[PDB]
Structure 1
Amino acid sequence: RMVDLPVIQPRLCTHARWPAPVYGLLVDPSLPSNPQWQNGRVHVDGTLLGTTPISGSWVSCFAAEAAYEFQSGTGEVATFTLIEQDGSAYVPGDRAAPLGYPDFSGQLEIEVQTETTKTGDKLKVTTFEMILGPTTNADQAPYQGRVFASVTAAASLDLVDGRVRAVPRSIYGFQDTIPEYNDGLLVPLAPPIGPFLPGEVLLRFRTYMRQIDTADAAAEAIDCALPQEFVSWFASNAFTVQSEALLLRYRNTLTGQLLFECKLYNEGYIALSYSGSGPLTFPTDGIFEVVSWVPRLYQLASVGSLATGRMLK
Structure 2
Amino acid sequence: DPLAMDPVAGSSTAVATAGQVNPIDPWIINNFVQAPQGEFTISPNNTPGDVLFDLSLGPHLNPFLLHLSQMYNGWVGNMRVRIMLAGNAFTAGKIIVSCIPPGFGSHNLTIAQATLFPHVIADVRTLDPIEVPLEDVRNVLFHNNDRNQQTMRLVCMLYTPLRTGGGTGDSFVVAGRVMTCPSPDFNFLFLVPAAAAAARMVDLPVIQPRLCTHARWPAPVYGLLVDPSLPSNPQWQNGRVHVDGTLLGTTPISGSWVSCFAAEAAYEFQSGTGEVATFTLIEQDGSAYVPGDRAAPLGYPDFSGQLEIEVQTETTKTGDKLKVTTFEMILGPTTNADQAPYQGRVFASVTAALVDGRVRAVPRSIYGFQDTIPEYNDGLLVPLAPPIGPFLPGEVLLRFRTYMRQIDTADAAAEAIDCALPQEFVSWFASNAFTVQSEALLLRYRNTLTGQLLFECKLYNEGYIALSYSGSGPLTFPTDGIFEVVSWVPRLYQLASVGSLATGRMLK
Considering the TM-score relative to the shorter chain, is it more than 0.5? yes
1:215 Cα shift?
A: 0.5
Deviation at 1:310, TM superposition (A): 21
Counterpart residue number, 2:291: 92
Q: Compared with structure 1, are the counterparts of its residues 263 and 254 closer, same or farther at alpha carbon in structure 2 (3 Å cutoff)?
A: same
Distance 1:311 1:105 in 2: 55
Decide whether the 8 Å contact of 2:233 with 2:389 is kept in 1. Answer: yes
Q: What secondary structure sits across from 2:424 in the alignment?
A: helix
Q: Is the 8 A contact 2:420 2:464 kept in 1?
A: yes
Change in Cα spacing, 1:35 to 1:307, as seen in structure 2 (3 Å) is farther
Aligned-pair CA distance for 1:303? 3.7
Shift of 1:260: 0.3
Matched, 1:168 2:363: yes
Separation in 1, partners of 2:305, 2:390: 27
In structure 2, distance between residues paired with 1:278 and 1:208:
20
Deviations 1:197-256 (A, max 9, x none): 000000000000000123111000000000000000000000000010000000000000
Q: Residues 121 and 239 of structure 1: is their aligned pair in 2 closer, same or farther, counting only changes over 3 Å?
A: same
Q: List aligned pairs for 1:192-211, cutoff 5 A.
A: 192-211=387-406
CA shift, 1:74, in A, is 7.8
Aligned to 2:338, which of 134, 139, 159?
A: 139
| CA displacement at 1:76 relative to structure 2 | 1.0
After TM superposition, the score normalised by the length of structure 2 is 0.58
Alignment size in residue pairs: 307
Deviates more, 1:224-233 or 1:69-78: 69-78
* % same residue: 100
Q: Which runs of 4+ in 1 moved over 6 A?
A: 304-313
Residues 268, 274 of structure 2: 8 Å contact kept: no
CA distance, structure 2, for counterparts of residue 73 and residue 106 of structure 1: 26
Q: Distance in 1 between matches of 2:367 and 2:390?
A: 31
**1:179 aligned counterpart, secondary structure:** coil
- Report Cα offsets for 1:128-154 as digits up to 9, x if no partner: 0000000123210000000000012xx
What is the alpha-carbon distance in structure 2 between the residues aligned to residue 312 and residue 176 of structure 1? Answer: 52
Is residue 17–residue 60 contact of structure 1 (8 Å, CA) maintained in 2?
yes
Q: Give yes or no for contact 1:62–1:167 (8 Å, CA) kept in 2.
A: yes
Deviation at 1:312, TM superposition (A): 28
- Supply the distance in 1 between the matched residues of 2:405 and 2:312 (Cα, whole angstroms): 20
Cα contact 2:394–2:470 (8 A) shared by 1: yes
Given that 2:438 and 2:489 are in contact with CA atoms closer than 8 Å, whether structure 1 keeps it comes out as yes
Q: CA RMSD in A?
A: 3.4
Q: Is the 8 A contact 1:274 1:304 kept in 2?
A: no
Aligned-pair CA distance for 1:286: 1.3
> For residues 310 and 108 of structure 1, do their structure 2 counterparts lie closer, same or farther at Cα, with a shift above 3 Å needed?
farther
> Structure 1 residues 102 and 229 mapped into 2: Cα distance closer, same or farther (>3 Å)?
same
Greater CA drift, 183-192 or 213-222: 213-222
- SS where residue 407 of structure 2 aligns? strand
Aligned to 1:258: 453
**Cα offsets for 1:243-280 (capped at 9, x unmatched):** 10000000000000000000000000000000001100
Structure 2, unaligned runs of 5 or more: 1-199
Q: Is the 8 A contact 2:267 2:276 kept in 1?
A: yes
Q: Which protein, 1 or 2, shows the higher relative CO under an 8 Å CA cutoff with sep ≥ 6? A: 1
Corresponding residue number in structure 2 for 1:155? none
Asked whether the equivalents of residues 67 and 79 of structure 1 are also in contact (C-alpha less than 8 Å), the reply is yes
- Separation in 2, partners of 1:178, 1:294: 32
CA spacing shift, 1:22–1:135, aligned 2, 3 Å = same
User: Is this contact kept in 1: 2:267–2:274, CA < 8 A?
Assistant: no
What does the per-residue CA deviation read over 1:14-73, in whole Å, with 9 as the maximum and x for residues that have no partner?
000000000000000000000000000000000000000000000000000000024759
SS in 2 for 1:15: coil
Q: Is the 8 A contact 1:25 1:281 kept in 2?
A: yes
Is the deviation greater in 177-186 or in 133-142? 133-142
Residues 251 and 286 in structure 1, CA contact (< 8 A), matched pair in contact too: yes
Give the Å deviation of 1:291: 1.1
Instruction: Answer with 1 or 2: which has the greater Rg.
Output: 2
1:128 maps to which residue? 327
**Quick one: structure 1 residues 74 and 304, their matched pair in 2 at CA, closer, same or farther if it must change by over 3 Å?**
farther
Q: Secondary structure of the equivalent of 1:143?
A: helix
User: What SS does structure 1 have at the residue aligned with 2:486?
Assistant: strand
